């Protein structure tokens, strides 16, 4: 069975804790590692990358019968306007204070049509939100921008296995899983040792 675009439920075991039950929506099957799926879990805004059929923490995976909701985008031009832009995204804290996070809107999310992929200068992982709602509520500022793009000059990085050294000097690996269409110098890396999707800029140094 193809599980992309399906709702799923599975068990999860964190450390030596109880098996917990989770529901989510399968957004993507990564072409350069088709064991790797991108999932949005109900109630949480981060995109998770899990090898759902290989990960020893995943059990009792089932496809749910319920269909993913499809709502018409309220302002299609606005959606197109925010893609690739720097933003200031307003959140609020426990004392009601406003807490602005600088970030960048990367793309429309797959499968979940009113959601947008976004990442943050101070939290460089992939999130998704229904940002047209934030925008109409006055909680999203879209900043203006400031062929020779690094991501246009180099040979494709997608599907390359990255290597890096820890402070302790041991080698760890990951994979360049995606190049952002709207921002070709921006890339997604999935590290073999973690389930977040990290966002990197390809920068010319010489």
């Amino acid at each position: 069975r193809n599980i992309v675009g399906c709702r799923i439920q599975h068990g999860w075991k964190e450390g030596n804790g109880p098996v917990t039950q989770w529901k989510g929506t399968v957004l993507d099957q990564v072409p350069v590692n088709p064991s790797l799926y991108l999932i949005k879990y109900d109630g949480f805004d981060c995109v998770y990358g899990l090898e759902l059929n290989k990960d020893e923490r995943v059990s009792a995976l089932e496809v749910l019968p319920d269909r993913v909701a499809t709502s018409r985008i309220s302002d299609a031009h606005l959606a197109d306007t925010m893609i690739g832009k720097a933003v200031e995204h307003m959140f609020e804290t426990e004392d009601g204070s406003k807490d602005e996070w600088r970030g960048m809107v990367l793309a429309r999310a797959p499968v979940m049509n009113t959601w947008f992929y976004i990442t943050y200068e101070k939290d460089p992982v992939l999130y998704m939100y229904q940002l047209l709602d934030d925008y109409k509520e006055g909680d999203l500022r879209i900043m203006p921008d400031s062929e020779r793009e690094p991501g246009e000059v180099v040979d494709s990085l997608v599907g390359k296995q990255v290597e890096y050294a820890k402070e302790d000097g041991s080698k760890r690996t990951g994979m360049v899983i995606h190049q952002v269409e709207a921002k070709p110098s921006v890339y997604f890396i999935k590290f073999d040792d973690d389930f977040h999707i990290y966002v990197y800029d390809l920068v010319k140094t010489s």
Binding site: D155, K160, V162, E163, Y164, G174, I189, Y198
Partner: peptide, 29 residues
């Protein structure tokens, strides 16, 4: 607790492009 590297500048096949670095979105500017 996993820590993503600030910079990525190696591929296992040695082909990382000369003149560039991948910088995590949290990298200093």
């Amino acid at each position: 607790t996993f820590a993503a590297p600030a910079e990525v500048r190696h591929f296992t096949d040695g082909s990382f492009p000369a003149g560039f670095v991948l910088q995590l979105f949290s990298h200093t500017q």
